[PDB]
Amino acid sequence: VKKLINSQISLLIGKGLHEFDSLRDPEVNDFRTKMRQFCEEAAAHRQQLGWVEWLQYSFPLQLEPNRALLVNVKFEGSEESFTFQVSTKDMPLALMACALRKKATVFRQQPEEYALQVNGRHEYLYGNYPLCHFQYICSCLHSGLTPHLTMVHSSSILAMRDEQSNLWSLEQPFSIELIEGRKVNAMKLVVQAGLFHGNEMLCKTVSSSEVNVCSEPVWKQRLEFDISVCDLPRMARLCFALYAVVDCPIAWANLMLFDYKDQLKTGERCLYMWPSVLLNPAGTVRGNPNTESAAALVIYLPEVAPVYFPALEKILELLREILERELYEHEKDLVWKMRHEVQEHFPEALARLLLVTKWNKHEDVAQMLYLLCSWPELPVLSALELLDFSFPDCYVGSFAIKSLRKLTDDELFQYLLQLVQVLKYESYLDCELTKFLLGRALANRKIGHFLFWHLRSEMHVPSVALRFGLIMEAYCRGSTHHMKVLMKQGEALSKLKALNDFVKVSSQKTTKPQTKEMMHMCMRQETYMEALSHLQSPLDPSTLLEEVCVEQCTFMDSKMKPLWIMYSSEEAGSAGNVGIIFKNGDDLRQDMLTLQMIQLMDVLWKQEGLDLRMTPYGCLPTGDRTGLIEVVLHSDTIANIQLNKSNMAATAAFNKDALLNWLKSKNPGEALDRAIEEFTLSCAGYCVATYVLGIGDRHSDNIMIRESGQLFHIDFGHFLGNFRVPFILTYDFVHVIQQGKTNNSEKFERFRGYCERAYTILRRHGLLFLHLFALMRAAGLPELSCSKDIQYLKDSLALGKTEEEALKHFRVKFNEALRESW
Numbered sequence: 160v161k162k163l164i165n166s167q168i169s170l171l172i173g174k175g176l177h178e179f180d181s182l183r184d185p186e187v188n189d190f191r192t193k194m195r196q197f198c199e200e201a202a203a204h205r206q207q208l209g210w211v212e213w214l215q216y217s218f219p220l221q222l223e224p225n226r227a228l229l230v231n232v233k234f235e236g237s238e239e240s241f242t243f244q245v246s247t248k249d250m251p252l253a254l255m256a257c258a259l260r261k262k263a264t265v266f267r268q269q270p271e272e273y274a275l276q277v278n279g280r281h282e283y284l285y286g287n288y289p290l291c292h293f294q295y296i297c298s299c300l301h302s303g304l305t306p307h308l309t310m311v312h313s314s315s316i317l318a319m320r321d322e323q324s325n326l327w328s329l330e331q332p333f334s335i336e337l338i339e340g341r342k343v344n345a346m347k348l349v350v351q352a353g354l355f356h357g358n359e360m361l362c363k364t365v366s367s368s369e370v371n372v373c374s375e376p377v378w379k380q381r382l383e384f385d386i387s388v389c390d391l392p393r394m395a396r397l398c399f400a401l402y403a404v405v406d407c408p409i410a411w412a413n414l415m416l417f418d419y420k421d422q423l424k425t426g427e428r429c430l431y432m433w434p435s436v437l438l439n440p441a442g443t444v445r446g447n448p449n450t451e452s453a454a455a456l457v458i459y460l461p462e463v464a465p466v467y468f469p470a471l472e473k474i475l476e477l478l479r480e481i482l483e484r485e486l487y488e489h490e491k492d493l494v495w496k497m498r499h500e501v502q503e504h505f506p507e508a509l510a511r512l513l514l515v516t517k518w519n520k521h522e523d524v525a526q527m528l529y530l531l532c533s534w535p536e537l538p539v540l541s542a543l544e545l546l547d548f549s550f551p552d553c554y555v556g557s558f559a560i561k562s563l564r565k566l567t568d569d570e571l572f573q574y575l576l577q578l579v580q581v582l583k584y585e586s587y588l589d590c591e592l593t594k595f596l597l598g599r600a601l602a603n604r605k606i607g608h609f610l611f612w613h614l615r616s617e618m619h620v621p622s623v624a625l626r627f628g629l630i631m632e633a634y635c636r637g638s639t640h641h642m643k644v645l646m647k648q649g650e651a652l653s654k655l656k657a658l659n660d661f662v663k664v665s666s667q668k669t670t671k672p673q674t675k676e677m678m679h680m681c682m683r684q685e686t687y688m689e690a691l692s693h694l695q696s697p698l699d700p701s702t703l704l705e706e707v708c709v710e711q712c713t714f715m716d717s718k719m720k721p722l723w724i725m726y727s728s729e730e731a732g733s734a735g736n737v738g739i740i741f742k743n744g745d746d747l748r749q750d751m752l753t754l755q756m757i758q759l760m761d762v763l764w765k766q767e768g769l770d771l772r773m774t775p776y777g778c779l780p781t782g783d784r785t786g787l788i789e790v791v792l793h794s795d796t797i798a799n800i801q802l803n804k805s806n807m808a809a810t811a812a813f814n815k816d817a818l819l820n821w822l823k824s825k826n827p828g829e830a831l832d833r834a835i836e837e838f839t840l841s842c843a844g845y846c847v848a849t850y851v852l853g854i855g856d857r858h859s860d861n862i863m864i865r866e867s868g869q870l871f872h873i874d875f876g877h878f879l880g881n882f883r884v885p886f887i888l889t890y891d892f893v894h895v896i897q898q899g900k901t902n903n904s905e906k907f908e909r910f911r912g913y914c915e916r917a918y919t920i921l922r923r924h925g926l927l928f929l930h931l932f933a934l935m936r937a938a939g940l941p942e943l944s945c946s947k948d949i950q951y952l953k954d955s956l957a958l959g960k961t962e963e964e965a966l967k968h969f970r971v972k973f974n975e976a977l978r979e980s981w
């Protein structure tokens with residue numbers, strides 16, 4: 160029984176559970192035990208929940224950040240439905256009450272017992288909220304489509320829950336014996352060694368003696384550091400760098416001076432080094448698992464006796480305003496002097512105080528930790544800044560989580576990608592961040608779905624494969640049913656990869672209609688038909704990919720031959736006519752990050768009352784250079800619309816009219832007025848979005864138009880001006896904005912106003928963009944690798960200037976794009 164679950168986890172995570180045992184590591188074994196129990200206890204509480212509370216887990220509410228409408232309602236065991244005339248201000252309970260009264264007149268004879276399931280979707284309508292606050296109703300309100308809902312009784316929901324169950328004394332300096340190496344290179348070898356506490360040094364780096372390349376080099380040298388053993392912070396990091404000199408970097412390796420049990424490491428240690436692109440403190444504290452080819456560094460941690468880092472009770476036992484808006488030595492001394500006044504009057508300034516404290520002097524740390532243990536809870540924004548590698552202390556790490564508990568399931572979902580990357584900065588497997596991540600994942604099925612995929616997509620990277628595999632296993636222990644649900648998704652993606660491999664080969668050997676017909680024949684096979692059907696969309700668990708519409712499936716002509724997979728659902732009808740894009744060969748992490756950042760911009764705008772009709776379509780990396788994209792139906796690229804093909808309704812005399820004529824054929828008469836507003840709003844939003852994010856390499860092939868008039872951008876191959884990029888304005892768009900007139904200044908000044916507003920709103924939450932992009936440096940992304948990358952945002956947002964100076968600077972950049980526009 161349990162054996163099947165193990166073999167299931169192994170296949171799902173893509174790593175055998177025997178691999179964890181084979182290492183014979185007690186840190187791993189202790190993580191597996193402690194977290195399993197934690198996740199099994201998390202699974203237990205879930206079984207003793209209420210039916211509404213279970214709906215809050217399985218299907219969390221999709222809400223938005225008067226006027227009547229038609230709504231179709233049916234009951235679970237019947238085809239017969241009723242169409243009502245409800246208001247957008249109505250609660251689902253009133254709609255549920257109408258459905259029960261209309262059932263009673265048909266059947267010839269309480270709303271609080273039911274829930275409204277969205278037809279052919281893992282979405283529900285409940286809670287004291289008006290219908291126009293629900294994301295599904297709003298999708299139906301703007302498109303004009305009729306919403307279809309199903310009355311699901313408390314007993315049927317409770318049936319689902321049931322079928323889905325399971326010390327200061329050591330004053331000598333820190334020193335090490337650098338014994339020998341086992342590397343490969345072309346010259347002499349030097350071992351540079353430093354002691355770090357996050358981004359900064361505890362003492363100055365000490366180098367080794369130049370020993371000839373004759374690999375398998377021997378030093379047997381005693382390296383001393385200008386720091387006392389008693390001064391070593393709990394999270395102290397000993398970092399090594401091996402390089403060739405007559406500079407050529409060869410490899411790097413880091414290790415924690417204390418273990419997971421808080422004991423100071425002593426003795427002989429073999430360090431399997433990682434290849435180099437000089438000293439890398441941010442890099443992993445675990446060795447290269449490629450012991451076969453990886454270079455090794457033999458070092459000795461000298462004994463000082465068993466010494467454990469002191470417990471919290473022992474640690475606890477032992478012109479100010481003008482600068483508080485990078486600081487000189489005298490200024491640092493000021494903040495440390497008036498450290499008590501910071502706790503009392505500037506709690507949010509905790510970050511600046513944590514950076515001025517001398518972590519290389521243990522008495523200074525104890526005083527800081529004493530202030531931290533009695534420090535007031537920080538706002539979510541400040542707690543996000545504290546998760547950065549700049550704050551490596553465990554007690555600091557704990558404080559950040561403590562302040563992040565007030566995060567809503569909506570807020571946490573938005574920053575989940577960033578919180579997952581931060582796991583790479585973690586020094587030990589058992590951490591307060593994982594316990595928080597798992598805890599929230601097991602209390603919300605949507606959080607858990609995306610936690611899984613964010614971890615599973617990185618299993619091909621050896622440095623994080625152990626950590627992630629272990630996290631994903633603990634999650635599976637807490638959710639046996641979800642593990643199976645996730646397995647179905649993996650089976651589909653497995654088949655998609657093989658089908659794509661065929662398409663890739665065939666496209667080089669025959670014509671497109673021939674390859675297309677054989678993709679279809681391959682899809683129609685029993686194993687393919689069964690695997691590609693009846694699964695929760697990995698891009699959105701609430702979207703159900705039911706029957707695969709094989710005839711409507713195809714592939715794309717770009718280098719990587721991306722797959723176009725279409726679906727259909729009877730129950731959902733038109734909300735079940737969903738499409739996905741499978742791409743293999745390109746890394747989709749940046750694309751996801753860019754779409755998430757655009758998705759947040761849209762949230763920050765919608766909170767301020769402004770809806771710039773953005774298209775935040777899904778993008779999810781799933782494996783090694785593998786991922787998915789959400790199809791935006793009834794949309795086409797600018798280029799395809801501009802190709803002005805014959806026999807069509809969009810016959811344009813001039814190129815500038817290509818877009819407007821297309822919108823005319825898709826929006827007739829009084830429908831076009833709406834489409835032009837949709838275009839103007841979305842154009843304004845994407846103009847500011849692309850400018851702030853610094854998206855380059857823009858052409859008619861990567862800009863798309865919805866049939867509703869809504870403009871959007873695809874394929875974000877380059878961001879932060881990494882190819883300083885300017886604002887972009889195209890004559891064909893200005894023409895649409897101006898309703899198809901050479902001079903329509905009033906429609907353009909309104910457009911210029913949408914840009915300024917969007918720009919001012921983003922600037923107010925500028926720090927939110929800085930803190931998130933700073934945590935994203937942990938991903939490895941080459942275009943977001945250093946501080947110079949972060950600098951583009953500081954400039955594009957102008958966060959060191961006043962609103963009047965920044966709005967003027969924006970007008971200058973807007974005028975430079977208008978002049979460049981032909």
Ligand SMILES: Cn1nc(-c2cnc(N)c(-n3nnc4ccccc43)n2)nc1C1(c2ccccc2)CC1
Nearest residue numbers: 713714715723776788789790791794795796873874
């Ligand atoms: C009708 N159509 N719709 C799309 C579409 C819709 N939603 C998307 N999300 C999307 N995205 N987005 N990112 C992407 C990155 C690579 C490829 C597409 C990407 N593309 N593409 C087409 C065309 C097409 C479609 C099928 C076959 C041949 C040609 C070009 C005309």
